[PDB]
Amino acid sequence: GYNVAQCNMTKDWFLVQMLANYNIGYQGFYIPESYKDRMYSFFRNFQPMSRQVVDDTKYKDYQQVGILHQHNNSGFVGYLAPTMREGQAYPANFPYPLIG
Amino acid sequence: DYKDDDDKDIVMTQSPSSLSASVGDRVTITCKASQSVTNDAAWYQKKPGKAPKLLIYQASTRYTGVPSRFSGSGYGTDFTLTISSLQPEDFATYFCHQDYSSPLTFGQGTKVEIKRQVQLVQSGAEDKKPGASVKVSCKVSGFSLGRYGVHWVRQAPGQGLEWMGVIWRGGTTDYNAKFQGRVTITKDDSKSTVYMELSSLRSEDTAVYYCARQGSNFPLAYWGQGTLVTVSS
Amino acid sequence: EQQKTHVFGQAPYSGINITKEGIQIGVEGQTPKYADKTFQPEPQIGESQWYETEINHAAGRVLKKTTPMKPCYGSYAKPTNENGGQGILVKQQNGKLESQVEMQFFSTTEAAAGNGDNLTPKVVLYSEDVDIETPDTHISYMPTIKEGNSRELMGQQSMPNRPNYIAFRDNFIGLMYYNSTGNMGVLAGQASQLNAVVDLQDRNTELSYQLLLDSIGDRTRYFSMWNQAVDSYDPDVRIIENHGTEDELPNYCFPLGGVGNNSTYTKVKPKTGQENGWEKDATEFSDKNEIRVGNNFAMEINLNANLWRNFLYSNIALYLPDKLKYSPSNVKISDNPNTYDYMNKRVVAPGLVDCYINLGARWSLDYMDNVNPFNHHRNAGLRYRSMLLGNGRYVPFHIQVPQKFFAIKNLLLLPGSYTYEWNFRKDVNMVLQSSLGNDLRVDGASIKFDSICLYATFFPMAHNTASTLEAMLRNDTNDQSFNDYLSAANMLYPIPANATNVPISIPSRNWAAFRGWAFTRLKTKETPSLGSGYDPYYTYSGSIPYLDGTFYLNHTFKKVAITFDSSVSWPGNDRLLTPNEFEIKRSVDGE
Amino acid sequence: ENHGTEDELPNYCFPLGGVGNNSTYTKVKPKTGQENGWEKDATEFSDKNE
Amino acid sequence: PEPQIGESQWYETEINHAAGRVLKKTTPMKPCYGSYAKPTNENGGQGILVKQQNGKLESQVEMQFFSTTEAAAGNGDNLTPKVVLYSEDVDIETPDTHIS
Amino acid sequence: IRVGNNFAMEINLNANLWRNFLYSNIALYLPDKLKYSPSNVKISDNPNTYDYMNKRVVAPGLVDCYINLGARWSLDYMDNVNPFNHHRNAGLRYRSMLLGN
């Protein structure tokens, strides 16, 4: 339980950066003042992120299907080039559902 | 209701079993299939010591350079072989055949007795003890292996013709179910040779072994010189 | 009975030949090579040119007659192998998996006209049964209820499933038990059992933090750690400003070759001494030159009308009241309307929210005035908080929760040891929030807490200086004093159906230190039960106005009358034109 | 930030003429004494009706 | 038949008895973009009513039966309409568009 | 069975939308001297009426996709044309919608 703010930045470094940039640490965390948070300042540009991706450790059905045979949207678009439509209509094979 | 299974055994029954003749006789031979072969009966002539020769295909057509005294007729189950007026080369043993299914099948051979350019060369003869393995070669020239599939048939002394298998032009093999996976055919395209390897030998497998090749869309017309394989205890 | 198998096919791939071994797609020197049925021919591969080519060896793939007909849109079949094939494998007796892909050979109608002698299929289709399903779409028109595949069942039309977001709320609202007596928090001395925390149902801890943050700083800047990405709504969805389409010029779709509908021409050359003399030319030049007389062939589309219609139906229309909808035919729907299944499949006609609605006016839709607008898929804050957790349903998370209670949070705490205990809620309709406000319990959402760890940040003061400040902060005159930002006792009064007049009254008491009154109207549906703990008859999981401040029925008040004791008016002394009553609104004033 | 797009309503493109391809019809008029009797109408009306 | 209620099936399906509406020649030409015609009844119809002898307004819609040139090429015994069109004068106007 | 690729038509969406924008917000507000009167459609005798202003036809080739392509530059005929007399004037648009439709 040493990470912070819903990412893989640590509590220690986050406190340190807030103290260096804006002096917020010791009296609690809140959004910085605008005239102090400008273009080259931390919080102004600080962007955390997350996403979910398919498992292969406890996921038993798993097959790695390459780009060479992916056909989501078959016969509506060129094959691995920005060229004109190629193929027929058919069911979609990729990606697996991460919701539902 | 009444359907016959494509890709199943068809018993080809040839009557009369034996026949007796003298020069100038009109001879009639009949062939009865046990499930329909439509317009696809083929008739062969075989000398007891030599390979089969194609007479008739598609119920009535003569193969290139077959003599005019031969003719065929019939449809469905029933087919006929007529010698308009028999000559002295006609003393032979004749075979019914159909290419309407896989396994391909022949009869038991009927016997006509007296009233008293492409090359396929196979490997030399040999013999062996039961359970042992054999490999026969069949060198081909006058065609390339990728343009047509190559067949393997065998003839036992006393018996008829046993279709063993085939390796088609592209390399898809298909074997006779009677051999329980003992047949295995391979080929070298560059050396223009087909190999036939048979495994788990029996005394039943004491026979002459033939390389064959068919036309465009009709039967076997090019045959090897035969390979004798014998197995005794 | 005698029923005939009809195929609807498409063969895009041109190969070299067609034998019983399949379509030939190549050569291995001397030997010809044929398509592997497990994944080849492949759906995405076809002609690489625009102009018209005869093809005498063609192939493609097709779904079996044991495979349910589904609309192509939204169709998915999981891959059965690592070569991207979809068609199902069956586990045989010997233990091996075996392929079900079957070849179907076809000829042209003219070729089937003959006797068969020179017959060779011109087409071959690789037929397979794939485990089709529809994840993210449903049926907008189901023509028939008849079992198995059929041409009537090819008439089926699709529509995508509505977006549904589920997340943790702004500032983790309601995770903590604030304002309930038995589930009261605890702060106490280790040298004396007596709790510092005094809590009741009158208090509204959440709302005081919300309005306090607003007073302090901008809420349109989103900060992850506290989940302080506020709820909001798109103004152009709340308020329609209907200016009409920017479609002034004609917009066009054209052929692949930009010409089309061509005719055949044979060239002619002049005889140079005659006024109209001419001679045919079929020598170096073709006698069948294709030329399209007049303009190229064309189609028209109006971009802005389609875009404006799509915007309106997606963002407003599917969110209309249930009295303006209907249930789809030959398609079933949940009896409980708090399900996602009912919101998703209910049909509203496009003619209620088309081009001309409110045209030339700036006007919210009347059916939408009494609809809460925060509960919408374009709410940037809920979408942002849903993306903090991720795209997936399954989420191992870590979250940092603040103490929001006014007395505790501005406190400075001196040496000693202390009991600090709190209570947390696990009910999904409170801790999670959903876009349509669906009952999450029934719809199967679940949260299971692993661990919890209390962090505190210290100042590492020098010991002489800390001693000096401690000596001073321990004196009698120097106790700490705090007060709420809301500083009010909160009260909720029930309003029956169509009750226009709401009188309330308070028994006689003292009115020194009174700051004034403030008031709104909420919905019974949208309001948790005070001191309930858990309420299984609270079925709504949208925005919670009592806590998060999203009041919207302010407009539904007409006038207010304030009366102290029997006839003592306030403010009174003839201060307003109506002196005894504050009139908020009036239908057509003339005065 | 992949949030998908509105796709709720199908969008369509049509011929310049709206209608598209048509076939030729002759008019007919009913025989009044019958329940189902018809007679060609080639009076003031064209024989090549779209 | 109301003019907006059309085919239930997308694919190539012959229609043995088909029906629609058409404007009579007494009404002038106007483009489809910008066309507006007010209801002459509460049923939704745009068909002009003409005042009868006994003073009542009455609809003058006229049916036009048609069949294909190949069917009118035969003797006349099998001749029967595949189509019936409802011809009408309607009260067209264009108010927010002009002719360019 | 259809052999080869599916039937199709092609459209370039952004060029049409851009081309529509160029004609709507600029070409229609051009100086009246760059326009012409339509052939076979009557127009007002008075040039200060909505009938005269609604019917004078400006060629789209006057503000087409390629003009100033790669520049930030205002149209030269429009440098002396009032930009607030415009249907995108949100203020005038709002003041009207305070009265209604």
Side-chain angles (χ1 to χ4, degrees):
Chain A
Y2 288 2
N3 289 352
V4 93
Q6 291 51 78
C7 55
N8 62 337
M9 198 188 297
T10 68
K11 295 167 206 307
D12 293 328
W13 183 245
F14 178 51
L15 181 61
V16 175
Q17 287 326 276
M18 287 295 278
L19 292 174
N21 294 258
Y22 311 102
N23 292 257
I24 293 163
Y26 290 105
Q27 288 202 289
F29 296 124
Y30 66 92
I31 299 168
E33 291 207 299
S34 51
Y35 72 101
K36 292 186 186 285
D37 189 36
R38 302 187 203 197
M39 170 55 67
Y40 299 117
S41 313
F42 173 37
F43 193 59
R44 184 61 69 176
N45 305 266
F46 172 32
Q47 288 326 317
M49 296 165 271
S50 274
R51 60 171 179 189
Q52 255 74 39
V53 58
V54 64
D55 179 37
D56 68 329
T57 63
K58 288 162 194 171
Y59 193 32
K60 54 175 287 288
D61 294 341
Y62 183 78
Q63 307 300 314
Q64 183 182 74
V65 168
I67 180 63
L68 291 166
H69 311 299
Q70 299 170 3
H71 53 67
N72 187 11
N73 301 272
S74 63
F76 303 120
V77 263
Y79 176 43
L80 299 179
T83 45
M84 62 178 77
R85 169 290 287 94
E86 292 175 85
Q88 55 166 120
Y90 206 55
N93 66 341
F94 187 81
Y96 294 102
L98 294 167
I99 53 89
Chain B
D1 298 341
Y2 300 94
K3 189 190 75 181
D4 304 318
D5 299 334
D6 293 332
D7 283 9
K8 186 166 290 178
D9 337 347
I10 305 186
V11 179
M12 318 299 291
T13 310
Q14 298 178 240
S15 37
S17 46
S18 70
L19 308 96
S20 56
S22 195
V23 173
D25 286 341
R26 188 156 292 145
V27 172
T28 58
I29 302 172
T30 322
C31 180
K32 295 185 71 71
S34 51
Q35 97 181 21
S36 182
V37 297
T38 57
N39 58 308
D40 295 319
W43 291 98
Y44 283 76
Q45 177 200 80
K46 188 189 179 304
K47 308 302 288 177
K50 291 199 286 178
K53 294 174 66 191
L54 174 65
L55 299 194
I56 304 296
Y57 59 92
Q58 294 210 289
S60 59
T61 303
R62 297 186 276 252
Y63 164 59
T64 194
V66 161
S68 53
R69 62 185 178 276
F70 299 124
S71 53
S73 178
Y75 186 77
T77 66
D78 298 312
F79 303 91
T80 295
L81 176 55
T82 271
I83 326 189
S84 185
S85 60
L86 180 126
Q87 287 198 245
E89 162 192 80
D90 301 341
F91 308 114
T93 167
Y94 290 87
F95 287 90
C96 189
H97 169 72
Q98 64 77 29
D99 63 334
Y100 179 74
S101 286
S102 187
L104 287 89
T105 50
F106 302 77
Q108 79 290 338
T110 56
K111 288 86 183 183
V112 174
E113 292 289 340
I114 318 118
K115 186 48 184 75
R116 302 308 285 183
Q117 160 66 350
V118 178
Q119 294 302 22
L120 307 91
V121 284
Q122 312 175 207
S123 44
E126 55 167 324
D127 78 347
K128 258 144 174 66
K129 293 294 191 185
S133 52
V134 64
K135 202 172 78 175
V136 184
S137 304
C138 176
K139 169 72 173 196
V140 153
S141 53
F143 71 105
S144 179
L145 305 193
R147 297 292 175 194
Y148 309 81
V150 175
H151 290 265
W152 277 99
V153 203
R154 83 170 174 198
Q155 198 237 235
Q159 314 313 124
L161 286 168
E162 280 196 301
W163 175 87
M164 302 194 62
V166 66
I167 183 169
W168 293 115
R169 56 174 73 190
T172 317
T173 42
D174 183 5
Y175 317 126
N176 179 343
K178 166 177 180 173
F179 290 105
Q180 321 310 324
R182 286 169 52 214
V183 177
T184 287
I185 306 171
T186 58
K187 71 197 171 67
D188 278 311
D189 296 13
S190 70
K191 296 179 214 163
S192 59
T193 298
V194 185
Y195 313 101
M196 179 286 297
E197 172 164 296
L198 183 66
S199 69
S200 300
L201 291 161
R202 311 301 303 158
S203 76
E204 285 185 287
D205 314 308
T206 294
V208 178
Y209 294 58
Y210 280 104
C211 196
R213 198 213 85 182
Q214 65 174 248
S216 47
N217 47 3
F218 70 91
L220 317 176
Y222 312 92
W223 289 82
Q225 84 183 117
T227 296
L228 177 82
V229 178
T230 306
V231 176
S232 315
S233 195
Chain C
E1 296 314 294
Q2 176 41 256
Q3 308 170 286
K4 285 196 186 304
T5 314
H6 258 280
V7 206
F8 169 38
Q10 165 172 12
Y13 172 70
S14 178
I16 317 176
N17 182 242
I18 304 180
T19 62
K20 59 195 166 330
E21 280 172 303
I23 179 148
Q24 192 201 326
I25 72 182
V27 291
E28 298 194 25
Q30 289 307 307
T31 279
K33 188 187 195 60
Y34 301 90
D36 165 9
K37 58 189 181 201
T38 61
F39 76 105
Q40 300 190 82
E42 292 184 75
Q44 73 289 347
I45 288 164
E47 319 188 78
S48 302
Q49 297 173 167
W50 54 277
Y51 54 86
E52 186 158 88
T53 305
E54 73 213 313
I55 301 179
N56 287 138
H57 294 291
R61 303 191 87 78
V62 78
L63 311 180
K64 272 286 196 192
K65 58 150 173 175
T66 50
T67 306
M69 300 167 144
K70 289 281 199 170
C72 197
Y73 176 93
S75 287
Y76 170 85
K78 57 183 299 172
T80 51
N81 61 100
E82 281 191 7
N83 326 292
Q86 292 175 116
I88 310 147
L89 311 170
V90 174
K91 198 195 175 172
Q92 290 310 304
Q93 168 70 91
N94 55 336
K96 103 176 260 305
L97 295 172
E98 182 57 57
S99 191
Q100 299 323 291
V101 190
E102 177 171 43
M103 304 179 196
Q104 281 297 338
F105 300 92
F106 300 79
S107 62
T108 51
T109 40
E110 182 160 276
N115 58 357
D117 299 355
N118 289 353
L119 170 72
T120 289
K122 299 314 166 54
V123 176
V124 53
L125 294 177
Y126 283 61
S127 62
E128 70 192 334
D129 172 27
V130 308
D131 189 8
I132 25 66
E133 74 190 67
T134 48
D136 51 8
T137 79
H138 75 274
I139 315 295
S140 52
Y141 175 55
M142 172 45 84
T144 196
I145 195 117
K146 293 159 193 174
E147 285 162 356
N149 297 350
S150 65
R151 216 181 302 234
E152 180 164 88
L153 191 50
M154 288 179 31
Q156 74 181 276
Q157 276 166 78
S158 198
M159 171 187 186
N161 308 328
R162 289 181 62 193
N164 182 358
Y165 296 91
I166 309 164
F168 295 132
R169 298 178 179 260
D170 179 39
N171 296 337
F172 302 107
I173 277 170
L175 187 134
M176 308 180 73
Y177 280 82
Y178 299 131
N179 321 131
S180 302
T181 48
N183 311 105
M184 172 180 315
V186 197
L187 162 55
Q190 284 293 114
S192 60
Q193 295 179 66
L194 171 77
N195 181 7
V197 192
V198 182
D199 185 24
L200 302 158
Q201 290 167 191
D202 295 309
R203 288 185 196 296
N204 189 345
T205 291
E206 302 286 6
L207 205 68
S208 182
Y209 188 77
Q210 298 305 92
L211 303 175
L212 184 57
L213 275 162
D214 186 58
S215 80
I216 291 161
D218 183 24
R219 275 300 221 112
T220 64
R221 291 200 78 190
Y222 298 172
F223 173 40
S224 58
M225 175 192 182
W226 298 143
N227 276 207
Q228 198 152 88
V230 80
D231 301 311
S232 44
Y233 54 86
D234 190 347
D236 286 350
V237 172
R238 180 69 153 157
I239 320 101
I240 299 178
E241 174 201 286
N242 191 1
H243 53 90
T245 50
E246 297 169 80
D247 77 283
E248 283 67 41
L249 286 175
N251 303 122
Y252 299 125
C253 311
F254 292 111
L256 315 174
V259 181
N261 298 340
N262 52 40
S263 298
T264 32
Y265 273 88
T266 306
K267 181 178 162 181
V268 282
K269 65 168 210 179
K271 303 191 198 183
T272 54
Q274 304 196 321
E275 271 193 314
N276 197 6
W278 307 97
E279 185 43 44
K280 180 186 169 177
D281 178 30
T283 66
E284 178 165 302
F285 305 71
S286 203
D287 42 352
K288 284 191 298 185
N289 282 320
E290 273 178 6
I291 309 170
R292 167 62 176 174
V293 166
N295 295 345
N296 48 12
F297 185 40
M299 298 286 264
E300 196 179 309
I301 184 164
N302 174 327
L303 294 183
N304 277 250
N306 279 269
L307 289 160
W308 191 232
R309 283 171 41 95
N310 188 18
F311 157 67
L312 294 181
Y313 197 87
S314 184
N315 294 276
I316 298 100
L318 288 162
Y319 293 69
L320 290 153
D322 180 56
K323 77 187 204 159
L324 304 169
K325 315 182 173 165
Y326 62 87
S327 295
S329 181
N330 303 346
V331 171
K332 291 177 168 183
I333 196 178
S334 170
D335 266 349
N336 171 17
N338 289 277
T339 58
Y340 172 55
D341 175 276
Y342 192 101
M343 297 157 170
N344 189 56
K345 305 175 178 163
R346 281 296 277 186
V347 188
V348 56
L352 300 146
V353 224
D354 199 359
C355 314
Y356 51 83
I357 70 106
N358 290 349
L359 187 67
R362 207 188 107 271
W363 186 265
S364 63
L365 274 161
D366 296 294
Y367 324 106
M368 287 293 286
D369 294 353
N370 313 287
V371 161
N372 175 346
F374 287 91
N375 299 336
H376 176 249
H377 83 282
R378 293 177 173 217
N379 170 358
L382 175 74
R383 181 202 303 183
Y384 181 97
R385 295 182 319 260
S386 185
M387 287 179 176
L388 287 170
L389 285 170
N391 45 281
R393 54 177 283 203
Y394 320 114
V395 179
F397 62 76
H398 75 299
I399 58 161
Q400 299 84 49
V401 195
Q403 168 64 269
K404 290 172 279 170
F405 186 73
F406 85 97
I408 302 173
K409 59 187 284 303
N410 291 330
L411 190 149
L412 190 147
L413 186 61
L414 298 172
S417 308
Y418 309 91
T419 285
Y420 178 38
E421 163 176 55
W422 226 269
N423 283 220
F424 319 99
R425 292 192 183 59
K426 306 162 51 174
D427 186 21
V428 284
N429 275 356
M430 310 311 192
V431 306
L432 314 178
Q433 186 184 336
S434 57
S435 48
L436 312 181
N438 51 275
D439 183 10
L440 285 164
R441 318 195 188 97
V442 174
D443 290 337
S446 53
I447 185 146
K448 178 286 291 185
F449 298 109
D450 293 340
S451 39
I452 181 171
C453 276
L454 165 62
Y455 288 75
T457 300
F458 295 79
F459 213 78
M461 208 177 263
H463 303 345
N464 57 4
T465 298
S467 308
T468 288
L469 190 55
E470 156 149 267
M472 281 198 303
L473 277 167
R474 302 290 187 155
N475 307 337
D476 298 309
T477 47
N478 302 0
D479 308 321
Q480 323 196 283
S481 47
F482 315 102
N483 77 273
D484 191 15
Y485 188 67
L486 189 66
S487 285
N490 303 271
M491 280 303 268
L492 300 177
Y493 301 107
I495 314 165
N498 301 329
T500 58
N501 203 36
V502 185
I504 48 174
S505 53
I506 299 91
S508 185
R509 53 182 317 299
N510 185 251
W511 292 133
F514 191 56
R515 281 165 62 252
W517 309 261
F519 50 94
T520 181
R521 177 189 208 164
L522 302 199
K523 279 194 204 185
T524 44
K525 167 171 299 181
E526 309 177 308
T527 301
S529 176
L530 331 175
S532 62
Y534 166 74
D535 194 10
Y537 298 163
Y538 177 84
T539 63
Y540 163 88
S541 66
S543 60
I544 296 164
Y546 184 80
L547 294 179
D548 65 53
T550 55
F551 317 121
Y552 67 97
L553 295 173
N554 295 330
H555 71 276
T556 65
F557 293 55
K558 178 174 178 293
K559 58 88 173 281
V560 189
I562 310 186
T563 308
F564 280 83
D565 307 313
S566 318
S567 75
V568 187
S569 182
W570 191 103
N573 296 266
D574 192 10
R575 284 282 190 272
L576 292 114
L577 318 171
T578 46
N580 288 326
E581 58 188 274
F582 305 80
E583 187 127 262
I584 289 161
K585 77 192 178 180
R586 316 179 66 232
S587 50
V588 179
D589 82 319
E591 313 94 327
Chain D
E1 190 192 309
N2 187 357
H3 48 76
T5 53
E6 294 77 356
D7 190 5
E8 288 62 54
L9 279 178
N11 314 135
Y12 289 101
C13 72
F14 315 108
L16 275 54
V19 179
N21 317 94
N22 61 61
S23 163
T24 47
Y25 292 72
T26 319
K27 194 153 171 301
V28 305
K29 69 171 167 176
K31 301 188 172 174
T32 42
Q34 280 172 20
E35 290 188 72
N36 181 35
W38 304 94
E39 190 175 319
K40 165 155 55 168
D41 180 0
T43 59
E44 180 180 307
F45 285 75
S46 178
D47 47 1
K48 285 177 300 180
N49 300 298
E50 293 156 78
Chain E
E2 297 178 51
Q4 82 289 346
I5 313 186
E7 290 189 88
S8 298
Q9 290 163 238
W10 62 274
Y11 50 69
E12 168 189 293
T13 313
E14 67 176 65
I15 310 178
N16 274 109
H17 295 287
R21 306 201 84 74
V22 67
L23 292 166
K24 290 190 167 176
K25 68 175 170 191
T26 16
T27 284
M29 285 176 179
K30 293 289 194 181
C32 167
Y33 186 89
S35 281
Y36 170 87
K38 51 168 263 170
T40 50
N41 49 81
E42 296 166 303
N43 308 330
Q46 308 92 58
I48 288 161
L49 304 152
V50 187
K51 186 179 206 175
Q52 286 316 117
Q53 174 80 86
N54 54 301
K56 66 182 306 301
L57 310 189
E58 186 62 85
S59 187
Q60 310 310 313
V61 177
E62 180 167 11
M63 301 161 189
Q64 310 207 128
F65 302 99
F66 293 91
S67 70
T68 39
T69 51
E70 176 169 288
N75 65 5
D77 159 37
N78 312 103
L79 181 81
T80 193
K82 168 162 186 180
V83 201
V84 55
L85 289 182
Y86 298 79
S87 68
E88 45 182 18
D89 265 337
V90 317
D91 198 27
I92 45 142
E93 93 206 54
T94 40
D96 64 3
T97 51
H98 58 262
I99 300 311
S100 71
Chain F
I1 304 185
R2 173 194 168 84
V3 174
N5 287 330
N6 69 16
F7 186 67
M9 304 310 194
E10 184 166 316
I11 174 176
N12 171 1
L13 299 173
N14 299 325
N16 278 288
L17 284 164
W18 186 243
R19 179 63 180 272
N20 281 6
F21 174 68
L22 290 151
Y23 197 74
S24 193
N25 288 316
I26 314 91
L28 290 172
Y29 289 82
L30 292 175
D32 175 43
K33 62 186 189 188
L34 300 179
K35 320 195 187 174
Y36 58 100
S37 288
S39 186
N40 298 350
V41 167
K42 322 188 176 171
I43 187 150
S44 173
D45 286 341
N46 177 3
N48 303 257
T49 67
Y50 171 70
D51 182 5
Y52 181 102
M53 293 182 179
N54 180 41
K55 286 152 192 169
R56 285 281 294 174
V57 164
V58 83
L62 301 162
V63 186
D64 204 349
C65 297
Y66 34 92
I67 68 102
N68 304 328
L69 179 65
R72 185 167 191 265
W73 177 273
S74 61
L75 200 299
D76 302 332
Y77 303 106
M78 293 287 299
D79 289 342
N80 298 116
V81 180
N82 182 317
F84 296 110
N85 290 349
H86 198 204
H87 51 268
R88 280 198 171 220
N89 181 7
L92 172 52
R93 178 182 298 187
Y94 184 66
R95 292 187 314 260
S96 183
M97 288 175 163
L98 290 176
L99 301 168
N101 47 336

